[PDB]
């Protein structure tokens, strides 16, 4: 039961547009470079954050059909998703290489050790599923285009946008692991789990601070 050409084309749309979006090596050098001060750690990260958000927005704007959405709903989707969106790139990065210092920078960047440890424990867990870079793309597109965000005027329209992306996934879980069937919901449930970790993300941003610096312009657009 292989995939169709139409489905095969969206996939190669998604990757090509997922992988195209790189992060600027100016920073990729910085991580494997700069001083290891509590402060410098936090600056190096809010960079990564803000730079990522930009890549997100780029990525969403490529997503098929996003074009066609009430602008108040383009906004609403990207604010809802963005956090969770980042948790996936995170889970991608932290169980792939020869740059473990990103973990290192975080474990001295002003975040509480009570916050940090679960996030990684969750990240490790999602390592276990062992997920094709394909799967991360689709799973991201699905989180983005997720209709049930707060302040999302016309749902439906979003449901119908996300439907291809799901549908394609449901095949892959057959055409790559027909062993366990309840896999599709394996992923779609880990999905639902991530939609918690952002309330915990919330209560951190309040605490978080190092030698009282301040957050990048875009990233402040979440909360105060």
């Amino acid at each position: 039961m292989e995939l169709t050409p139409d489905q095969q084309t969206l996939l190669h749309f998604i990757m090509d547009s997922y992988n195209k979006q790189r992060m600027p090596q100016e920073i990729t050098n910085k991580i494997l470079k700069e001083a290891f001060s509590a402060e410098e750690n936090f600056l190096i990260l809010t960079e990564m954050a803000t730079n990522h958000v930009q890549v997100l927005v780029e990525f969403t704007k490529k997503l098929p059909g996003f074009q066609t959405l009430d602008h108040e709903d383009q906004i609403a989707l990207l604010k809802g998703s963005a956090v969770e969106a980042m948790f996936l790139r995170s889970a991608e990065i932290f169980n792939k290489g020869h740059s473990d210092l990103l973990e290192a920078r975080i474990r001295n960047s002003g975040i509480s050790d009570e916050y940090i440890t679960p996030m990684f424990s969750f990240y490790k867990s999602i390592g276990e599923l062992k997920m094709t870079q394909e799967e991360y793309a689709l799973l991201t597109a699905i989180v983005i285009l997720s209709p049930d965000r707060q302040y999302i005027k016309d749902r439906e329209a979003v449901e119908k946008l996300q439907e291809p992306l799901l549908d394609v996934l449901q095949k892959l879980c057959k055409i790559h692991q027909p062993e366990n069937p309840q896999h599709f919901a394996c992923l779609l449930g880990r999905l639902t789990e991530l939609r918690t970790f952002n309330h915990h993300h919330a209560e951190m941003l309040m605490s978080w601070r190092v030698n009282d610096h301040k957050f990048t312009p875009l990233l402040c657009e979440i909360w105060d």
Binding site: V57, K61, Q74, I75, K79, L218, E221, I222, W223
Partner: peptide, 10 residues
């Protein structure tokens, strides 16, 4: 939140 004055563009 308020007026997320954020241009998608670029």
């Amino acid at each position: 939140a308020l007026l997320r004055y954020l241009l998608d563009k670029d």
